[PDB]
C-alpha cells in the first residue's frame, strides 16, 4: 500500500512484475539505454558506459525504490548525469518514457516467456474530401518520422470507413497481411507516442505561468478589479465591474450603466469609474471579451485612466492587460461556480474567473474537472489521441509543473480551491489526497514540522520521502518552530544543510562536535539568520570543493542538492515559474474573433458584408464583426475622382479580397475588384511519385459530368 498511487494504478494489471533475473535485469537496461539513445543521438560509442550507468540507476530508483520521476529529478538528478557539464542530462520527458517502457519491457518479456509456460478511396470515397479541405494531402515509415499526425489522419478516415491503406509492398515480384498489420499497429502506436509527446509540451507551456506582477521593482500581491465589455452593445448592456481583495475573495460586484461613448455626456462614465477606483483602489484591471467591441472598449479605458492621472503609490498607471478567458469560459457553465456564488450573473462569475486566472493559472487549470479539461482546445489534433493517452499526457503535465512550485498544508487543509491541486502532488493521488486532508481535519492543528507527519503516522516511509520535500510550512513568529520548514529542503539532507551553513559561519573545527555531541545543529542556521553579512559570508563558499569531500568521504553524490540548499539559504521559496503572458497581438485578434488562420489570413478570398459607407472609402463586415478598409482606388473609384455611391448597393453579398491584416488594431484592407476577387490558396505535393496525377486527371471527368449525372 506504501506505493505511489500513479504507479499503483499502473502496475495494477501486470502480474509478477517484481521477479526479474539478473540477465533479465541486464537486458532491460541495455535495451532501455539502447532506446533512448536512439532520441539522444550519440556518436560513435561517445564512452556510452557511462550513459547505460545513468539508466542503471534510473531504473534502480523507479522499479526498487519507487520513486517518482519528480523526486528523482529534484533531490536525485546528480546520479541520472555526467559528473562532467553538458554531458549528459535525462529530461523529464525521458524519466517518462524510461517508465513507460520499463512498464512495457517486463510485460513483453512476461509474454515471451510465457511460452516456455498509397491510398484506397471507397464507395464512401469522393465524398467527405470534396477537394478543398485540409484532408487534401508512397507513404513510407521513414516519412511518419517528421509528420507522423498524417498516419493519424489516414486511420482516422479508415475508422470511419472512407479510405483504406493497404501496406507498402509493390516491390512484390492473408501470409503478407497477417505479417504486416502487427506493423501497423506498431506504427499507430509509435505515431500516437510521438504526438502524445508535444501536447503534453504545449499544455506544459500553458501552466508554466507565475502569478501577474504589477510592480516590477517592488512586486507584492496585487488588488485586481476585473471588468468586461459585454455583448459589446453600448450604451446598453451595462458594463460589469468585479472586485476581489490580495487573499482572493470576492469582495464587491459593481455595474456601470453608464455609455463609455456617449459622446452628449462622456463626463457620466468617466466620472463613476472613476468613483469605482476611488472605492476599491485596485493596482491592476483585467479585460476580455466576446467580440473585436473589447478592442474599442480597451482603448476608451486606457484614455480615461491616462485622462484621471489614475496611478498607484509608485505614481506609475494602474496597467491594464488582456487575460486569456478559456477557462474563463467554461467556468460560467461550472456547476461549482453555481454552487460557489447564488446569485450571481454570468459575466460576474465570468469576471471573477478572469480574476482568479490573474492570479494563479495554476490552481484555476487544476480545478478543471475531467470532461472539461478533456475538451479544452489544446492541440488542433488532440481528438486523434485516445482517451488514456491525452488523460496520461494531461496527468504527467500537472505532476511537474504542480511538484515544481511547493504546495502549503496549512492552506489546503481549509482552501479547497487551493487544496484541490494535491492530488498531483509527488506520490498521491485520488485515494491518497482525500484521505491525507481527511487526517489533517481531523488533526484540528497546524502542523508544526513535517516530522508531524510521520510521528502521527499520517504518512508512510515511502510516501513521505516522495512527497515531504514538496510540502512546506509558512515560516511566522516556539522551539518546535524551524527555518528549514520553511524552505523546499528535503529532511534527509537537513543535516547536510546545517554543516553547510557551519561551514559557511566559520564556526571552530572543535564546537561542531561540541554542538552535534549537544545536539545544538539548529543554532547554526538561527546565527546565520541573525548575522547582516549573509551575501559576501555566503557566496564566498565554493560548491564544487564541498560537494567532492562529501562524495569521498560519505560516498554520496548530491552537488545539485547543495546547490539547492544554498540557493534558497538566501531567500526562502523564490518563485521559479517564468513571467506572465498577456495576450499581444495575433492571438489577441485570434482570441477575440474567433476566425481561424485557415480562413481569415494575409490574402484570403472571403465574402464580406458591406454596412456602411464614407466619403471616399468604403466598410465591410465579416462573419465575426470584422471592419475591412478599402480605398476608392482598389474598386475603380478613385483613379477619375468622384464618389463611390455609383458603382455599389447596400445589402447585396459581395466577394472581396483581403490585402492587410492588422492583428492587433483589429482592422484590415481589401479588394473588391474582380481582378483581385476573381487563385490556389491551399496545395499540397504533387511530385508524381509523391503524389497521384493519374487518379487527380481521371477524377476531372466524374467531377465535371456529375453536376449532369
Known sequence: TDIPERYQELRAGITDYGNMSSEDQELERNWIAEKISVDKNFDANYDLTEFKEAIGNAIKFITKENLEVPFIYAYRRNYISSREKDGFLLTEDDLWDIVSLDIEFHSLVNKKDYVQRDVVLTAK??????????????????????????????????????????????????????????????????????????????????????????????????????????????????????????????????????????????????????????????????????????????????????????????????????????????????????????????????????????????????????????????????????????????????????????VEVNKATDNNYYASALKYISGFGKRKAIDFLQSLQRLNEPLLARQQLITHNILHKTIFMNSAGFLYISWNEDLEHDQLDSTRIHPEDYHLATKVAADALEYDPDTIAEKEEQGTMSEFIELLREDPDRRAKLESLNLESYAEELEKNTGLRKLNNLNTIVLELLDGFEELRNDFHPLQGDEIFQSLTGESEKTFFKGSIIPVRVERFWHNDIICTTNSEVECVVNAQRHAGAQLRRPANEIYEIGKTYPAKVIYIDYANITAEVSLLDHDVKYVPISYSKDPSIWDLKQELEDAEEERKLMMA
Open 125 to 406: 470515397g469522393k465524398k467527405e474530401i470534396q477537394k478543398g479541405s485540409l484532408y487534401e494531402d508512397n507513404r513510407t515509415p521513414m516519412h511518419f518520422r517528421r509528420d507522423p499526425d498524417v498516419f493519424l489522419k489516414m486511420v482516422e478516415a479508415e475508422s470511419l470507413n472512407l479510405l483504406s491503406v493497404k501496406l507498402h509492398m509493390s516491390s512484390q515480384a492473408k501470409i503478407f497481411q497477417d505479417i504486416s498489420q502487427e506493423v501497423k499497429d506498431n506504427l499507430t502506436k509509435n505515431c500516437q507516442k510521438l504526438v502524445a509527446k508535444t501536447v503534453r509540451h504545449k499544455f506544459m507551456t500553458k501552466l508554466d505561468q507565475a502569478p501577474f506582477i504589477p510592480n516590477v521593482r517592488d512586486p507584492k500581491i496585487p488588488k485586481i478589479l476585473s471588468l468586461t465589455c459585454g455583448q459589446g452593445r453600448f450604451g446598453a448592456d451595462a458594463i460589469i465591474a468585479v472586485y476581489v481583495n490580495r487573499k482572493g475573495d470576492f469582495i464587491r460586484d459593481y455595474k456601470i450603466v453608464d455609455n463609455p461613448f456617449d459622446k452628449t455626456n462622456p463626463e457620466k462614465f468617466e466620472d463613476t469609474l472613476d468613483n469605482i477606483i476611488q472605492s476599491c483602489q485596485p493596482n491592476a484591471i483585467g479585460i476580455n471579451g466576446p467580440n473585436p467591441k473589447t478592442q474599442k472598449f480597451y482603448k476608451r479605458l486606457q484614455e480615461v485612466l491616462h485622462k484621471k492621472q489614475i496611478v498607484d503609490s509608485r505614481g506609475h498607471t494602474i496597467p491594464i492587460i488582456y487575460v486569456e478567458d478559456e477557462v474563463a469560459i467554461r467556468y460560467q457553465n461550472s456547476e461549482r461556480a453555481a454552487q460557489e456564488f447564488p446569485n450571481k450573473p454570468p459575466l460576474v462569475k465570468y469576471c471573477i474567473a478572469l480574476a482568479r486566472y490573474m492570479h494563479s493559472p495554476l490552481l484555476e487549470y487544476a480545478n478543471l474537472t475531467s470532461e472539461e479539461v478533456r475538451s479544452l482546445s489544446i492541440h488542433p489534433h488532440q481528438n486523434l489521441l485516445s482517451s488514456e493517452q491525452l488523460s496520461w499526457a494531461l496527468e504527467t503535465a500537472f505532476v511537474d509543473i504542480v511538484n515544481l512550485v511547493s
